[PDB]
C-alpha cells in the first residue's frame, strides 16, 4: 500500500453496488492476504470466495512467484521472522513435540507450503481458476487488465497503480454497503497524474518497495513535486540536489524541506525500474471456471473449521442459488 496515496485519489472513486460486478472477470491478488498475520486465514478465505461467487463474479486469482523484496524494513522483519522459527524449531525437536515442529518448519522457508497448497485446494473446490505470476502478482494483475483479459482488479493495495493498472475495485470485503470503483482515465484527468508522477509520490510517501521519507505525507509530498518540476524521475533528482546543497551552506516550504532526512542513495532509480519494467506474462489464453463441489466442501469445512453439514450449507446454499439464476 501507499501512505495516503489512496487519500490523493479519493476524488476519482465512484461508489457502486456489488451487483454492478455480475459477470465481470476480475483479478484478485491472494499473495497479499497470505503474507500477513483455528485456521483463521482459511476461514477468511472461505467467506471471501462465497461473496465473490454470490455476486456472479468470474474471479481469477494470482499468486506471487519469486516476488522481489526491496524494502529494508521487510528485509529485517522477514529476516527476523524466519530466524526465530529456527530457534523454536531446533528446540522443539530437542523436547519431543513433533506436531509443533512441523508448524515452525513451514515458517523457516521463503514461502509457506501449507497455506499455498490449501488455498489452491479451496479454489479448485469452488471452481475458481488461479495462475502464478512469474514474479510480483500485482504486476501480473495489471498486465491482465491492460491486455483486456479482465475488467480490472479487486485489491486494497495502491501499489497496483504504479504497475500501470487502469480499473480497480476497493473495499469489496468490508461490511459497508457500496464498494469503490476507480479508473485511471478519471484521476489522470482530474489531477493530471500519470504513472511516473505516482512513482515519485511512492518514493516520498513510501510504498511496498520503499520506506519513504520520514514525516512526509500527502501535503509535503505534493509541495515537493510542485516545487521541482521535470519529467520521469527528474523531480526527485533536483529535489535531492537542492537538499544536499541546502545542508552545505527561505520560504515556509523550503525551511520544512530543509529539515527532512534523505538517505544517501536517494532517489534509488532501481525502485522506479521495478515498477515500470516488471517481469510479467502478457500471453493471451482463456481461463476456465468450474463450479463449486458441495460434498468436498462440506468435508474441507469439517477438517479445518469443524463445521457440520448444516453450518457449511448456511454459507454455500445461497451461492449455489445465485449461480443458477440470471
Q: Would the annotation count 186 as a binding residue?
A: no
Q: Would the annotation count 66 as a binding residue?
A: no
- Residues facing residue 154 across a β-bridge: 28, 169
The 10 Å Cβ neighbour count of residue 3 is: 19
Q: Would the annotation count 159 as a binding residue?
A: yes
Q: Buried b / exposed e across 262-295, counting CB within 10 Å, b at 16+?
A: beeebbbeebbebbeebebeeeeeebeeeebeee
Q: Three-class SS string for the chain? A: CCCCHHHHCHHHCEEECHHHHCCCEEEEEHHHHHCCCCCHHHHHHHHHHHHHHHCCCEEEEEECCCCCCCCCCHHHHCCCCCCCHHHHHHHHHHHCCHHHHCCCHHHHCCCCHHHHHHHHHHHHHHCCCEEECCCCHHHHHHHHHHCCCCCCEECCCCHHHHCCCCEEEECCCCCCCCEEEEEHHHHHHHHCCCHHHHHHHHHHHCECCECCCCCCCHHHHHHHHHHCCCCCCHHHHHHHHHHHHHHHCCCHHHHHHHCCCCCCCCCCHHHHHHHHCCCCCCCCCCCCCCCCCHHHHHHHHHHHHCCCHHHHHHHHHHHHHHHHCC
Give me the count of residues in the chain.
326
Q: Measured on CA atoms in the order 281, 141, 128, 55, is the torsion positive or negative? A: negative
Spatial distance between the Cα atoms of 326 and 244, rounded to a whole number of angstroms:
63
Q: Would the annotation count 38 as a binding residue?
A: no
**Cell numbers at residue 56, please?**
456472479
Q: Would the annotation count 208 as a binding residue?
A: yes
- Residues facing residue 130 across a β-bridge: 61
Q: Would the annotation count 313 as a binding residue?
A: no
Q: Buried b / exposed e across 36-59, counting CB within 10 Å, b at 16+?
A: eeeeebbeebbebbbebbbbbbbb
Q: Would the annotation count 64 as a binding residue?
A: yes
Give the CB-side neighbour count of residue 174, counting CA atoms within 13 A.
11
Spatial distance between the Cα atoms of 122 and 30, rounded to a whole number of angstroms:
12
CA 122 to chain centre: 20
Q: Would strands 167-170 and 25-29 be described as parallel, antiparallel, or unpaired? A: unpaired
Measured in angstroms, the resolution is: 2.0
The alpha-carbon radius of gyration of the chain (Å, integer) is 23
Name the experiment that determined this structure: X-ray
**Cell numbers at residue 108, please?**
523457516
Contact predicate 231/209, CB 8 Å: no
In the chain, after which residues is the C-to-N distance over 2.5 Å, breaking the chain? 37, 249
Amino acid at each position: 500500500g501507499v501512505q495516503g496515496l489512496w487519500k490523493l485519489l479519493e476524488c476519482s472513486g465512484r461508489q457502486v453496488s456489488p451487483e454492478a460486478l455480475e459477470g465481470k472477470i476480475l483479478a484478485v491478488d491472494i499473495s497479499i492476504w497470505l503474507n500477513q498475520a483455528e485456521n483463521p486465514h482459511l476461514l477468511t478465505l472461505f467467506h471471501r470466495l462465497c461473496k465473490l461467487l454470490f455476486f456472479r463474479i468470474r474471479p481469477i486469482f494470482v499468486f506471487d512467484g519469486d516476488a522481489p523484496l526491496l524494502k529494508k524494513k521487510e528485509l529485517e522483519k522477514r529476516r527476523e521472522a524466519r530466524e526465530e522459527a529456527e530457534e523454536k524449531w531446533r528446540e522443539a525437536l530437542e523436547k519431543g513435540e513433533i506436531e509443533e515442529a512441523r508448524k515452525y518448519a513451514q515458517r523457516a522457508t521463503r514461502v509457506n507450503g501449507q497455506m499455498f497448497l490449501e488455498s489452491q485446494e479451496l479454489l479448485r473446490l469452488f471452481g475458481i481458476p488461479y495462475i502464478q505470476a512469474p514474479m510480483e502478482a500485482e504486476a501480473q494483475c495489471a498486465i491482465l487488465d491492460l491486455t483486456d483479459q479482465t475488467s480490472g482488479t479487486i485489491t486494497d493495495d495502491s501499489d497496483i497503480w504504479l504497475f500501470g493498472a487502469r480499473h480497480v475495485y476497493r473495499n469489496f470485503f468490508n461490511k459497508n454497503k457500496f464498494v469503490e470503483y476507480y479508473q485511471y482515465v478519471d484521476f489522470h484527468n482530474q489531477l493530471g497524474l500519470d504513472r511516473n508522477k505516482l512513482i515519485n509520490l511512492a518514493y516520498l510517501l513510501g510504498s511496498d518497495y520503499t520506506e519513504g521519507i520520514p514525516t512526509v505525507g500527502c501535503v509535503t509530498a505534493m509541495e515537493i513535486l510542485n516545487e521541482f518540476p521535470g519529467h520521469g524521475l527528474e523531480p526527485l533528482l533536483k529535489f535531492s540536489e537542492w537538499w544536499h546543497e541546502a545542508q552545505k551552506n527561505d520560504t515556509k516550504v523550503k525551511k520544512k524541506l530543509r529539515t527532512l532526512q534523505l538517505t544517501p542513495g536517494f532517489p534509488n532509480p532501481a525502485v522506479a525500474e521495478a515498477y515500470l519494467k516488471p517481469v510479467v506474462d502478457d500471453s493471451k489464453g482463456s481461463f476456465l471456471w468450474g463450479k463449486p463441489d458441495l460434498d468436498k466442501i462440506r468435508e474441507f469445512c469439517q477438517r479445518y473449521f469443524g463445521w457440520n453439514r448444516t453450518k457449511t450449507d448456511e454459507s454455500l446454499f445461497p451461492v449455489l442459488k445465485q449461480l443458477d439464476a440470471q
